[PDB]
Design a protein around this ligand. Structure first.
Ligand code: ANP
Ligand code: HFG
Ligand code: NA
Length: 482
């Protein structure tokens, strides 16, 4: 009912349920894989959505909105997906003439019109984005935020005269996804390129951002940015008149990130007292709680607290003053801790006498006293350090989850020990399923290749692939995955 009753290590999954619900982030729903986002949760989405929008306007990306529905034949104009499509069949009691499908992505919808908007080089680059929801009916069991059947996302689609233009933006968007996670969610991600076997069917290459849940040792795709080259341009006959009057195919990118990011954050920073929010995604930065008992204290406290509130708010630091008389101080402590509020300020008699108050960080529970005069400044610096600390703890933790090894058995040791592994690899696609099905022999417990990180350690000259025996091309991250 109230309090988290499962240790994050002991039942991590029951923990997650308890946290997301009891923190007022979500509510479950009578349709599997769909979840209600209460304001505490949606606020987080809005914050990142603001950030991302800001950043893509600088790349002249423009928002837009395409329809939620797509027709059978249009949709089937990408591979291995059709069993995941939800079909609208009727309206009221009337069967529709043809099935129509709910968007799982907007490629087919959008790219059918592109040729119409793109006749010449003067038309390029074309840069669109959507904030919409999409629907995929997925076999693997749904889990709030991480794998949802409906989900909010942003989906970006661009088209350019040439690769230099296009690829450059791919990596531009990838960095924005890093910042999304690091500057806002304080979640560290590793940028990489996916393997041929795991990359997006219609992409030249898929660049990715990868996170890792230490507790169950599962990696997770945090965001995705593709160079598509001309693949879709061939499929939808999207062409332009060159600066010389030769017809050309366009070079496109698509990229997207979803509410999954919210789940990643929760899993990262959440603890046994409950939700822990980086301040940049919590409406309330501070909760002010009075702690006193003699009735004589009552007016003078209500004031001191109301004063402290005034200071913060003036400074555009939103906060709550829990002054409710029918709740124990410990109720209030637990409650706001659980809800993720970064800072509690405690006000009692010893602080009025002393012109001060106790501040307490949500991230690690250090308390201090600070003279009222300098509360504003100390609160601001605190909030920053809480971000600094949440992030840095999470990067120390990520790094300890990554073991660099060279042999197959070193690999299995690491995998058995809930790690993810950095290993030399030849990159032959034929090895991927072998490696998957054969590790799974010792949610799916196979070792997937996650991403070939951009930041490569050096490659010894004779270094062999840990599986093929073939000489290894580059270091790749492998792990069990969400
Ligand atoms: N069911 C889902 N719920 C929430 N987010 C999702 C879901 N499926 C994919 N994503 C995210 O969507 C982004 C874009 O990738 P996309 O190509 O749409 O999905 P995917 O690669 O098919 N799924 P996965 O195997 O789970 O990473 C990725 O960063 C995924 O993390
Ligand atoms: O959705 C994608 C590719 C990209 N589209 C928008 C930007 C980011 C995103 O990775 C991969 N994908 C994922 N799931 C799908 C599910 C179905 Br059903 C279909 Cl038809 C198609 C797809 C499908 O194409
Ligand atoms: Na994943």
């Amino acid at each position: 009912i109230l309090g988290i009753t499962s240790k994050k290590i002991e039942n991590f999954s029951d923990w997650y349920t308890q946290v997301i619900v009891k923190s007022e982030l979500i509510e479950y729903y009578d349709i599997s894989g769909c979840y209600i986002l209460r304001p505490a949760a949606y606020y987080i989405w809005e914050c990142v959505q603001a950030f991302f929008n800001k950043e893509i306007k600088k790349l002249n990306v423009e928002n837009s909105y395409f329809p939620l529905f797509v027709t059978k034949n249009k949709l089937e104009k990408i591979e291995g997906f059709s069993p995941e499509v939800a079909w609208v069949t009727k309206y009221g009691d009337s069967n529709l003439p043809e099935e129509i499908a709910i968007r799982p992505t907007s490629e087919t919808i959008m790219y059918s019109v592109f040729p119409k908007w793109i006749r010449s080089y003067r038309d390029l680059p074309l840069k669109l984005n959507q904030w919409n929801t999409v629907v995929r009916w997925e076999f693997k069991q749904p889990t709030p935020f991480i794998r949802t059947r409906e989900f909010l996302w942003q989906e970006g689609h661009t088209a350019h005269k040439n690769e230099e233009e296009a690829v450059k933006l791919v990596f531009d968007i990838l960095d924005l996804y890093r910042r999304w996670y690091e500057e806002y969610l304080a979640v560290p991600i590793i940028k990489g390129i996916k393997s041929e076997g795991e990359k997006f069917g219609g992409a030249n290459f898929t660049s990715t951002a990868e996170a890792f849940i230490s507790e169950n040792g599962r990696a997770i795709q945090a965001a995705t940015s593709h160079y598509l080259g001309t693949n879709f341009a061939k499929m939808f006959k999207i062409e332009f008149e060159d600066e010389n009057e030769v017809k050309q195919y366009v070079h496109q990118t698509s990229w997207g990130c979803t509410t999954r990011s919210i789940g990643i954050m929760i899993m990262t920073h959440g603890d046994d007292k409950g939700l822990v929010l980086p301040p940049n995604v919590s409406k309330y930065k501070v909760v002010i709680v009075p702690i006193f008992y003699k009735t004589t204290d009552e007016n003078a406290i209500h004031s001191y607290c109301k004063d402290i509130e005034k200071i913060l708010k003036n400074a555009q630091i939103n906060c709550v003053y829990d002054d409710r008389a029918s709740y124990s101080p410990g109720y209030k402590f637990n409650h706001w801790e659980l809800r993720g509020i970064p800072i509690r300020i405690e006000v009692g008699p010893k602080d009025l006498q002393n012109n001060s108050c106790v501040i307490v960080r949500r991230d690690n529970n250090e308390k201090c006293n600070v003279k009222k005069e300098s509360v504003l400044l100390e609160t601001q610096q605190m909030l920053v350090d809480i971000h600094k600390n949440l992030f840095l703890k999470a990067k120390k933790k990520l790094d300890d989850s990554i073991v660099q090894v060279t042999s197959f058995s070193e690999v299995m040791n690491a995998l058995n020990k809930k790690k993810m592994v950095l290993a030399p690899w030849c990159e032959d696609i034929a090895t991927e399923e072998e490696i998957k099905k054969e590790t799974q022999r010792l949610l799916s417990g196979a070792m997937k290749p996650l991403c070939i990180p951009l930041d490569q350690p050096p490659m010894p000259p004779n270094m062999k692939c840990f599986w093929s025996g073939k000489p290894a091309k580059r270091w790749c991250l492998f792990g069990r995955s969400y």
